[PDB]
Write an enzyme that holds these catalytic residues in place. Structure first.
Site, PDB file in Angstrom:
ATOM      1  N   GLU A  21      55.640  34.239-132.067  1.00 20.08           N
ATOM      2  CA  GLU A  21      54.937  35.389-132.620  1.00 20.08           C
ATOM      3  C   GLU A  21      54.023  36.082-131.620  1.00 20.08           C
ATOM      4  OE1 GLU A  21      55.574  36.489-135.543  1.00 20.08           O
ATOM      5  OE2 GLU A  21      56.386  34.814-136.704  1.00 20.08           O
ATOM      6  N   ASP A  30      55.486  44.991-136.151  1.00 16.98           N
ATOM      7  CA  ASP A  30      56.457  44.020-135.674  1.00 16.98           C
ATOM      8  C   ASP A  30      57.829  44.679-135.563  1.00 16.98           C
ATOM      9  OD1 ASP A  30      57.466  44.231-138.231  1.00 16.98           O
ATOM     10  OD2 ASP A  30      57.100  42.142-138.788  1.00 16.98           O
ATOM     11  N   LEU A  42      51.506  38.940-141.086  1.00 20.77           N
ATOM     12  CA  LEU A  42      51.914  40.193-141.706  1.00 20.77           C
ATOM     13  C   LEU A  42      50.833  40.635-142.686  1.00 20.77           C
ATOM     14  CD1 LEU A  42      55.584  40.946-142.593  1.00 20.77           C
ATOM     15  CD2 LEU A  42      53.711  42.071-143.797  1.00 20.77           C
ATOM     16  N   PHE A 114      57.445  30.405-142.524  1.00 21.57           N
ATOM     17  CA  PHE A 114      56.384  31.268-142.014  1.00 21.57           C
ATOM     18  C   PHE A 114      56.884  32.695-141.803  1.00 21.57           C
ATOM     19  CE2 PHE A 114      52.283  31.440-139.732  1.00 21.57           C
ATOM     20  CZ  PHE A 114      52.431  32.608-139.016  1.00 21.57           C
ATOM     21  N   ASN A 142      75.672  29.653-138.856  1.00 19.92           N
ATOM     22  CA  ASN A 142      75.400  30.440-140.053  1.00 19.92           C
ATOM     23  C   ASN A 142      74.044  31.131-139.977  1.00 19.92           C
ATOM     24  OD1 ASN A 142      77.366  30.057-142.702  1.00 19.92           O
ATOM     25  ND2 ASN A 142      77.678  28.515-141.102  1.00 19.92           N
TER      26      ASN A 142
END
Length: 174
Positions: A21, A30, A42, A114, A142
């Site tokens: 981050e 972001d 956020l 998170f 995946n």
């Protein structure tokens, strides 16, 4: 290397998310366009910068004017990590998968929650089954199809590698 063997004891969820981050003391958008501050906090999904500053002042407890200190970023970061851990452990779908994981992949699980939130992660039906069955290669493939990864690969690529290997190698040599 004796230095390589020590790197394990230096890595944890806090250092992991700090790398993914970054650390920003001012409000920024972001890779998805959402207002963010600190270590991946956020603030809001609204496009109104005034709403982002209002949520910041509420989270920190003072008139921030869009700026926080490093100590405030760490305090907010610790709260967000705790929230992601608690979100996993109270969820009947995520907790059994989490419990089955080794320590390093548990970090990747907290990291994933998170970033995406509990319901987003709990929607990876096939990945969760693959992880519980220790099908690491399939799980990573995946995960690489997801919109989470493909819209913002740099923030997610290391988490996916960690799910595949259960080591800290992707966080070496920045």
């Amino acid at each position: 290397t004796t230095e390589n063997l020590y790197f394990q004891g230096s890595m944890n969820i806090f250092e992991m998310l700090r790398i993914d981050e970054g650390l920003r003391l001012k409000i920024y958008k972001d890779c998805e366009g959402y207002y963010t501050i600190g270590i991946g906090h956020l603030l809001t999904k609204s496009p109104d910068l005034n709403a982002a500053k209002s949520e910041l002042d509420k989270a920190i407890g003072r008139n921030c004017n869009g700026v926080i200190t490093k100590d405030e970023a760490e305090k907010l970061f610790n709260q967000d990590v705790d929230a992601a851990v608690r979100g996993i452990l109270r969820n009947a779908k995520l907790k059994p998968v989490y419990d089955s994981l080794d320590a390093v992949r548990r970090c990747a699980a907290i990291n994933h929650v998170f970033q995406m939130g509990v319901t987003g992660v709990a929607g990876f039906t096939n990945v969760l089954r693959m992880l519980q069955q220790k099908r690491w290669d399939e799980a990573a493939v995946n995960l690489a199809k997801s919109r989470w990864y493909n819209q913002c690969p740099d923030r997610a690529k290391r988490v996916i590698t960690t799910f595949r290997t259960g080591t800290w190698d992707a966080y070496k040599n920045l």
